[PDB]
């Protein structure tokens, strides 16, 4: 039901015996001179290593990487590969292969500019992909975005495996090859949603993440975090703090321990722009999931004000949201401060996961429109991060209906450290 | 610093080649036919059988455990025992053997009767408990209170070893010798901390709550639960529900969703009394610690109304509160309602984190005192949880400055299902 068929165009699989498949990158190190490629072979476990070079130095290398499956249920996973190529050069195109063995296919990549404080970057916000036509639609405007993307912040609820009878966990296979027109060939940043949990005692699989972790690693390591749900990246002039909804965030916990250290090691001279991943939002004025997000935002929101988070993405919600700048930090149980006001050291926070999903949008809205909101839509869509500076950053929303040019809303980030006025 | 010394009394070592040692029982069902029998050998390996018997039959029998061992930086424990006793008959005393192989010691339980509505039961309760001198106290005025406690409802942070040089988990087996006395010979029902967490990367220990998890296990499969930090027990006429501060509970998670399932599975027909476990105090009115509580109330506070819990035991903070019965369920952002109301639909909520710790007392308080707090004093201390019938249950907090007859504070239940009345 508007989930596109499984003989769809976009799920047919690359021919040849042993072709990879589902092959997808993101950023493999801390600062951008490392990728981990990634894929599926169907038919045989086939080589790890990956064949590399750049279009200058013409110069062929090989990485090795390591093979792994995994099972769901009555599901049995394909033959994954994870390698992750290091000691790339900045700014520079690469082309690398998959399949050595037997059916090679080729790639390429743009590694992107040293960090720097004034480093243009544009990224792409996309949530709650799903694998609808709608979903589809999405894609096909992102890729053919004026703005052009360079990398897509990703926030989380990736396949929806889940929805199906025991998550037939080939609706994972398929939403891999239909990504792989755009992820093939520029990073994916994944965070984690609660579609890919899969806690499911009543079939036996009880292990939380398993299919998307298997399928899905990041640089986590690299950031000194002890959990793939949890990290950050730096990339241009952008510091990328990605955040687990759905694991623990107490006092004394992994993650909240992690993310308190973490914040102390931002360095806004280098990377000017702060962001912050997440898949629920911590501001969100539709009906559905409302409050969801009051958790964790008693934890971390205080924080966020005080580094002068730039930016929050989230999604889990099916539609788009602009908060204010604003932050409700002052409550103390009986001095009854529990309203949200205008400060100018808060981060926007951006609700983008309206991307597709199976196929049904968020309508019911909180009446009225709260003050903490700037701008709130129904509609399925996608948006444009894009960095031209260390004042400036410009965020357009593109809708589905409107033509791939046309931003239905816009506005200029101003920089919250170093050029923080009214925006 | 007021740890009790390595050389203590209380933390002798057993006599005799291989001789079991830090001897520990819990509840090892979902109603209380069988129970989980631990104990650690130093010598060698030993075997993990034990040898128990009913006073009623007096038949011998044996059950077959597990051993297991495990590591933290530098240290290595010495041979964990756990091994389940099932089967057992109701409301009766048994004996039970360990160490069948080198030095065996005996020790009894008395199983609690079969769940009923109107069956009495005393729990204590017990917090923070440590290891220094003011814990051997409020150790002490338990055994001896006149109320006679059956099973203790332990709120987390037990040893407070990760106090220590790395985590020194010799001070594990200083606790575990130390609380022998009582919990060799009733239950206690334990609730993960703060101090179980011990996640320490800086010397690759990044494993939360595993020297916690090795030494003390829970029934957890018998709740449905998928993890030994949340899960529940019935036991007399309570339903006993056992939660994790420091484990995911979003939307979603294994916690939240078995919390979810297992309220519904809640009958107060059979159980009355409908208690929570947890660490962290959804209510507190102390300095310390203040409003750590508060991510836990926006997912779970609700819930407890919902489902009419009769109360909430926590620890974390260094003394004793009671609260009213109140909720703070009516906020939504901007419509200004974040100030806690009486609501009789609520259950109370009490912090008993008192019994010693490492000897250090919270007193500093938020004044003046909130309306919905009733009660509250930083003294070291226990609580008793002394269930009559369906209607009623009495609490009562005894202090380690009083005799150990003496109640500070002390309060009637009344039941929120069977007798829903004002009982403020
Ligand atoms: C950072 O990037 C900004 C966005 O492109 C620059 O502002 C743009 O500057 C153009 C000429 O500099 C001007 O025609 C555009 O209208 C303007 N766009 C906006 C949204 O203002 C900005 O250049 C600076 O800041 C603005 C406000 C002016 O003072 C310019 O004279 C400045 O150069 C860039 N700032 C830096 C530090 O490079
Ligand atoms: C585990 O490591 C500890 C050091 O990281 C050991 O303790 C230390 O030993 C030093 C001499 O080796 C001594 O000067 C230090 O004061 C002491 N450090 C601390 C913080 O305690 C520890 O060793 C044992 O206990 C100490 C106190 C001495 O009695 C040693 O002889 C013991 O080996 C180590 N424990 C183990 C099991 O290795
Ligand atoms: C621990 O208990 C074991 C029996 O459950 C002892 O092994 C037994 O020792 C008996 C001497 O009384 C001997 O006849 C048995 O053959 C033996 N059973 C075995 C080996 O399975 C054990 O004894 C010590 O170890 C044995 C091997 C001999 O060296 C004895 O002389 C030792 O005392 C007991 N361990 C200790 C240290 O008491
Ligand atoms: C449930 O337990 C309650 C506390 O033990 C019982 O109340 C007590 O009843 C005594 C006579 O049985 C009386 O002298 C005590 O003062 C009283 N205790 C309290 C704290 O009220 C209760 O008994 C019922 O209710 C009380 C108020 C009287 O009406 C008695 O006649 C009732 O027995 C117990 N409920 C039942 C059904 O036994
Ligand atoms: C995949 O590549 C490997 C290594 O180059 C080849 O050995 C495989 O050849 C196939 O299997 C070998 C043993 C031989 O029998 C050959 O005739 C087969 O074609 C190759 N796999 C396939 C199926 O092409
Ligand atoms: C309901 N929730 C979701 C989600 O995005 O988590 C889909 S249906
Ligand atoms: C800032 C601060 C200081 C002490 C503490 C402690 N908590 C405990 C506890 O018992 O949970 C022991 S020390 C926590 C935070
Ligand atoms: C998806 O969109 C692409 C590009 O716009 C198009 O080529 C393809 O036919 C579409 N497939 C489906 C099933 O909608
Ligand atoms: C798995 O189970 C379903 C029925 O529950 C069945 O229809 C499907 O074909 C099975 N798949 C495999 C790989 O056995
Ligand atoms: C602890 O308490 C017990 C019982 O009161 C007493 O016999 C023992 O000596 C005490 N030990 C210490 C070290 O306080
Ligand atoms: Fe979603
Ligand atoms: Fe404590
Ligand atoms: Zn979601
Ligand atoms: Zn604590």
């Given at each position: 039901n508007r989930d596109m068929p499984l003989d769809s165009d976009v799920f047919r699989v690359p021919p040849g015996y042993n072709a990879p498949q589902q092959v997808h990158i993101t950023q493999g190190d801390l600062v951008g001179r490392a990728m981990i490629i990634s894929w599926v072979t169907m038919d045989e476990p086939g080589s790890s290593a990956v064949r590399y070079w750049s279009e200058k130095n013409g110069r062929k290398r090989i990485a090795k990487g390591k093979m792994s499956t995994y099972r769901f249920f009555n599901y049995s996973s394909g033959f994954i590969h994870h390698t992750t190529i290091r000691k790339l050069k900045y700014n520079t195109k690469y082309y690398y292969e998959v399949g050595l063995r037997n059916t090679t296919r080729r790639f390429s990549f743009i590694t992107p500019p040293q960090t720097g404080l004034d480093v243009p970057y544009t990224f792409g916000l996309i949530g709650?992909?799903?694998?609808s036509f709608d979903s589809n639609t999405t894609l096909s405007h992102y890729e053919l975005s004026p703005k052009k993307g360079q990398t897509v912040l990703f926030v989380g609820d990736l396949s929806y495996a889940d929805r199906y009878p025991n998550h037939d966990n080939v609706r994972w296979d398929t939403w891999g090859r239909f990504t792989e027109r755009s992820v093939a060939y520029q990073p994916w940043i994944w965070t984690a949603g609660?579609?890919?949990?899969?806690?499911?005692?009543?079939?036996?699989?009880?292990?939380?993440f398993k299919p998307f972790s298997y399928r899905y690693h990041v640089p986590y390591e690299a950031s000194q975090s002890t959990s793939p749900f949890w990290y950050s990246i730096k990339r241009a002039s952008a510091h990328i703090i990605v955040l687990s909804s759905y694991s623990a965030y107490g006092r004394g916990t992994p993650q909240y321990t992690w993310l308190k250290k973490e914040l102390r090691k931002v360095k806004r001279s280098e990377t000017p722009w702060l962001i912050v991943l997440m898949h629920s939002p911590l501001y969100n004025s539709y009906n559905h999931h409302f409050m969801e997000g009051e958790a964790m935002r008693t934890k971390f929101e205080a924080w966020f004000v005080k580094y002068k988070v730039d930016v929050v993405f989230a999604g889990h919600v099916h539609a788009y949201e602009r908060s204010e700048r604003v932050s409700n930090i002052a409550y103390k149980i009986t001095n009854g401060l529990c309203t949200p006001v205008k400060d100018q050291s808060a981060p926007v926070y951006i609700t983008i996961?309206?991307?597709?999903?199976?196929?049904?949008?968020?309508s019911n809205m909180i009446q009225?429109?709260?003050?903490?909101?700037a701008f709130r839509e129904a509609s399925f869509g996608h948006g444009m991060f894009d960095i031209k500076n260390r004042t400036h950053a410009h965020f357009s929303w593109n809708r589905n209906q409107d033509g791939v040019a046309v931003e239905a809303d816009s506005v200029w980030f101003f920089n919250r450290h170093w050029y923080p006025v009214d925006d």
């Open positions: 709650d992909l799903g694998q609660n579609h890919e949990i899969e806690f499911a005692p009543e079939i036996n699989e009880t292990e939380p996961g309206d991307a597709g999903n199976y196929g049904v949008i968020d009225p429109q709260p003050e903490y909101s």
